[model samples]
Target: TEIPDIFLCPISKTLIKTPVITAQGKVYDQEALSNFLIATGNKDETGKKLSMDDVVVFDELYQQIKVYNFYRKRE
Candidate 1:
């Protein structure tokens, strides 16, 4: 499944923005994502700070990544 570019922060409802890609597969605005992750102290399982590339890959392959206790809530 293809994921949309607009994502909501899990903890907050703030709209999360993704980097723009070029025809050559290069990413733009990576610094913004990097700064946000660093500011939030987001890390991987090994406790290392996540990079822009890491986040992009994670978003693209979300189905393959482990998710815990996600379910639909009643409205």
Candidate 2:
């Protein structure tokens, strides 16, 4: 994990070509994190599990994520 790690999913430890911010406001792989969140939802302030809606893809971060060809065609 180096400079590339910045664009990599902390969960999958892979490149986040399709990046998305999590409920905790940390960026990670879009497809991978989606699966991760489904299995391990990030806990909120009250120690409650958060849903996908709880996560966000803000303008600033969204601008940074580089969508892949496959995702571009599908999404």
Candidate 3:
């Protein structure tokens, strides 16, 4: 199946299990983003310092991806 690019994590390059949005509006897997932030000293792609508060669980994106996956499977 051709998974939508937005459904994939920029770091993991796979379907996001826990989608989180960064302050810069970029989406990434929660675990992956956490590791990246820790390794990079809490910085995002835009070089902006991000605290956990700046990242929120993207429930809407998760739902959209789930629906997309369901439809893709039936196709």
TM-scores, in order shown? Answer: 0.26, 0.54, 0.75
Question: After TM-score superposition, what is the CA distance of residue 10 in candidate 1 from its true location, in Å?
Answer: 3.3
Record all residue pairs in model 2 with backbone atoms less than 3 Å apart, i.e. clashing.
none
Backbone-clash count (model 2): 0
lDDT of candidate 2 at residue 71, scale 0 to 100: 57
Q: What's the C-alpha lDDT at position 34 in model 3? A: 83
Q: What is the C-alpha lDDT of each candidate?
A: 0.39, 0.59, 0.83
* Local accuracy of candidate 2 as per-residue lDDT tens digits, 37-56: 66655543345575666566
Counted clashes in each candidate structure: 0, 0, 0
Q: Weakest 10 consecutive residues, lDDT, candidate 1?
A: 66-75
Q: At residue 63, what lDDT does model 1 achieve?
A: 33
Please list the Cα RMSD from the true structure of every candidate, rounded to 1 decimal place.
10.7, 6.4, 2.1
Highest lDDT: which candidate? Answer: 3
Q: Which ten residues in a row have the lowest lDDT in candidate 3?
A: 44-53
- RMSD, model 3, all Cα superposed? 2.1
lDDT of 1 by residue, 1-75 (tens): 333334433323333344433233433344454555577676522454555544343345233222311321211
lDDT of 3 by residue, 32-71 (tens): 8888788889886667788766889999998998888789
Clashing pairs for model 3 are none
Worst 10 residues of 2 by lDDT: 61-70
